[PDB]
Design a binder for this molecule. Structure first.
Ligand code: HC4
Length: 125
């Protein structure tokens, strides 16, 4: 493992050092999105939760193609408000149910420290 707790206050600073391999050492799912919702990074824990193969989803649009069940005010609407504002820090439960067994999770979206990119962190509940 990497030693980082889900929901940690300074998670964006800790995950700024991780390349894709390091991200694969987290205890929770982690996705890095650009401001349009294209997938930049997608770790092994997330693939275990959702069934997606990480290298096959990087470059895809999370809200349009990968995760249409999240294209809603309750998930994508929060994301795009945060992108537009340039600030995002929200944690909520959600169900992932697209071409998969419905899976209840806790989601934490947080703007990355540098640049303009956005983390989506996920764990089972
Ligand atoms: C709903 O369509 C959710 C889909 C989904 C969520 C999270 C992922 O990493 C992959 C697909």
């Amino acid at each position: 493992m990497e030693h980082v707790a889900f929901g940690s206050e300074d998670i964006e600073n800790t995950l700024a050092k991780m390349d894709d391999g390091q991200l694969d050492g987290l205890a929770f799912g982690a996705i890095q999105l650009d401001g349009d919702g294209n997938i930049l990074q997608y770790n092994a824990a997330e693939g275990d939760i959702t069934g997606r193969d990480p290298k096959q989803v990087i470059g895809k649009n999370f809200f349009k193609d990968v995760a249409p069940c999240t294209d809603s005010p309750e998930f994508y609407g929060k994301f795009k408000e945060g992108v537009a504002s340039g600030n995002l820090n929200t944690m909520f439960e959600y169900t992932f149910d697209y071409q998969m067994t419905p899976t209840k999770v806790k989601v934490h979206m947080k703007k990355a420290l540098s640049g303009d990119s956005y983390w989506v962190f996920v764990k089972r509940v």
